[PDB]
Design a binder for this molecule. Structure first.
Ligand SMILES: CO[C@@H]1[C@@H](n2cc(-c3cc(F)c(F)c(F)c3)nn2)[C@@H](O)[C@@H](CO)O[C@H]1S[C@@H]1COC[C@H](n2cc(-c3cncnc3)nn2)[C@H]1O
Length: 139
């Protein structure tokens, strides 16, 4: 697609409430996973990881990695992605959580574990996708 995967979207000044990140693309026909990683260097404040075939099930895993410890996984069985199909992911930053919507439907909320939001300066987009667009705006 017009953007190369993996793709790093800089977040100058980090994330702040009211920030909306929009990502559009298509899932590859033989997809295994998608990853969105809100990063503070080597740490990952918010890892959003649709897994298409984990023990023969679809699941979204969300987590945080701080000092190479992954935390408690937050798992959602609701899974709005499909092999070969277009998607739109929107992540809205609020003061207490990230809110994620896919295809204009609310999917999940993830409470901030890494709380220095102005230091989360990169969003990495990786995995089995074609990416058409990735951008952010303050709403
Ligand atoms: C492979 O390690 C993944 C982590 N990961 C994935 C990637 C990644 C990055 C990229 F750039 C990529 F391109 C890319 F493809 C993947 N980087 N780190 C990350 O997703 C992390 C999130 O917690 O998970 C580990 S695997 C983690 C291992 O520990 C046990 C966990 N396990 C199994 C079950 C469980 C619970 N309920 C029902 N069935 C099974 N529960 N926990 C398991 O999920």
């Amino acid at each position: 697609g017009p953007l190369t995967v993996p793709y790093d979207l800089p977040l100058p000044g980090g994330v702040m409430p009211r920030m909306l990140i929009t990502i559009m693309g298509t899932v590859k026909p033989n997809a295994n996973r998608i990853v969105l990683d809100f990063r503070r260097g080597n740490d990952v404040a918010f890892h959003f990881n649709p897994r298409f075939n984990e023990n023969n099930r679809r699941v979204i895993v969300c987590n945080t990695k701080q000092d190479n410890n992954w935390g408690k996984e937050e798992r959602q069985s609701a899974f709005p992605f499909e092999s070969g199909k277009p998607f739109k992911i929107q992540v809205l930053v609020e003061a207490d959580h990230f809110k994620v919507a896919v295809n204009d439907a609310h999917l999940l909320q993830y409470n901030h574990r890494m709380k220095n939001l102005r230091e989360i300066s990169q969003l990495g987009i990786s995995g089995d996708i074609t990416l058409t667009s990735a951008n952010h705006a303050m709403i």
